[PDB]
A paper describes a structure:
During infection the influenza A virus NS1 protein participates in multiple protein-RNA and protein-protein interactions to perform a plethora of functions. The N-terminal 73 amino-acid residues of NS1 form a symmetrical homodimeric RNA-binding domain (RBD), which is connected to the central effector domain (ED; residues 86-204) via an inter-domain linker. Present models of the tertiary and quaternary structures of NS1 indicate that the protein possesses two globular domains, each capable of forming independent homodimeric interactions. Our bioinformatic analyses indicate that the N-terminal RBD forms a very stable homodimer, while the predominant and ubiquitous helix-helix contacts between C-terminal EDs bear many similarities with weak transient interfaces.
Previous studies using recombinant Alb/76 and Ud/72 EDs have shown that a single W187A amino-acid substitution is sufficient to prevent dimerization. However, as the strand-strand dimer has never been observed in structures from these strains, it may be that the PR8 ED behaves differently. We therefore introduced the W187A mutation into the PR8 NS1 ED bacterial expression construct. We crystallized the purified PR8 ED-W187A protein and solved the structure by molecular replacement.
Numbering used by the authors: 85 to 205
Amino acid sequence: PASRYLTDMTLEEMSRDWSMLIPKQKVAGPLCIRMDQAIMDKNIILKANFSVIFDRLETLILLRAFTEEGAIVGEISPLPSLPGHTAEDVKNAVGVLIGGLEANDNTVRVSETLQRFAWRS
């Protein structure tokens, strides 16, 4: 107490508005997954912001999928009910998005922060 945040996004990236040409949305536990169904054939990078506590990545604040050119085409966010999630919830929601984008022929990569979070639980 209190918490800090490690993030892959500039302050602009996590504040910017975005919308989906073809809006797809799915609830996975306490988290909302959105991805633009229209996006295809792109190289995508998943970037997250995590609360950091006791030097441990603690909880997902925001995840977004960016194309190589910086466009937001996917989002993972907790429900405003503020239902608290677990690291498995997160890893689960994340694979759902990955699968969603690879359906459309997008090559998906994850950030170093997520690469590390995968194995930290």
